[PDB]
Amino acid sequence: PIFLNVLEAIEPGVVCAGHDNNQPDSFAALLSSLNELGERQLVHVVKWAKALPGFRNLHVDDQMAVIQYSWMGLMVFAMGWRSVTNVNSRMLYFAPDLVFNEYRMHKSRMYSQCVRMRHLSQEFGWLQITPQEFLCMKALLLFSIIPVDGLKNQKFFDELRMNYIKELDRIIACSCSRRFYQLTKLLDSVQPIARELHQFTFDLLIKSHMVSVDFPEMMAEIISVQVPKILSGKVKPIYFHT
Ligand SMILES: C[C@]12CCC(=O)C[C@@H]1CC[C@@H]1[C@@H]2CC[C@]2(C)[C@@H](O)CC[C@@H]12
Question: How many A from CA of 159 to the centre of ligand 1?
């Protein structure tokens, strides 16, 4: 099981937000901590993606683009997994030092987005997603959002994505169609969540200095240059179902 060996081997370890849990929960503090967490996880996502089977087959520019478009979906998917794994789904396990209870979901001003993420977390439970289904789905997520004008080498991308789909199907196969159906619906359900988070972070970046939220430099760059391409519809998710 070469493919599965790789995905398991490359899976990132624990990442902390560096949040001060001893201090009363403010909007500014919670959101600055989520931003810092995002920046730290982006480093890990980049090294993960580069080690994925076939990833180096893409043009350098497509490598960068797929990561910049997909990171929100990928991080949310992993966060959902951690959440089923560690806590119990009233809660969102962003990091060991950054666990959201309902009170925090409210103070972050992200309550409804958090409700969507928790629904995702719960779905992993209800579908009884295996660790190996999780790993293959996460890999697929990196190849599920592209510019409508195409990538530099769209042909290699379409081939990469096909191969990850085949890998998910094998992991299922090893009825079957019911399971593939359910997993593809679950993958699709990540995309509305990512879209609402993209809107939210974009708004927050615009009004950031007003509300005293810090955006690390890499975060501010991607949210101002790449996230607006998704919100304006220049970059769109690939859905399995209509
Ligand atoms: C990806 C992160 C951070 C990593 C993670 O575990 C999931 C989580 C989802 C909410 C994101 C956050 C990064 C910072 C964002 C983008 C904030 O600006 C608003 C929503 C936050």
Answer: 30
Is the minimum distance from the CB of 186 to ligand 1 under 6 angstroms?
no
Structural domains in the chain, CATH included, are 2-237 (1.10.565.10)
59 to each of 42, 71, 112, 156, 215, how far by Cα in Å? Answer: 20, 18, 38, 9, 29
| Ligand 1 atom nearest residue 34's Cα | 14
Choose the residue to mutate in 39, 67, 72 for probing ligand 1, maximizing ligand atoms within 8 Å of C-beta: 72
How many whole angstroms separate alpha carbon 149 and alpha carbon 156? 15
The structure was resolved experimentally with X-ray
Q: How many residues does the chain have?
A: 242
What's the CA-to-centroid distance between 173 and ligand 1, angstroms? 34
Q: Resolution limit in angstroms?
A: 1.9
Rounded CA-CA distance 85/179 in Å is 21
The answer, yes or no, to whether any atom of ligand 1 lies below 6 A from the CB of 201, is: yes
Cα–Cα–Cα angle for 233, 235, 237, nearest 5°? 100
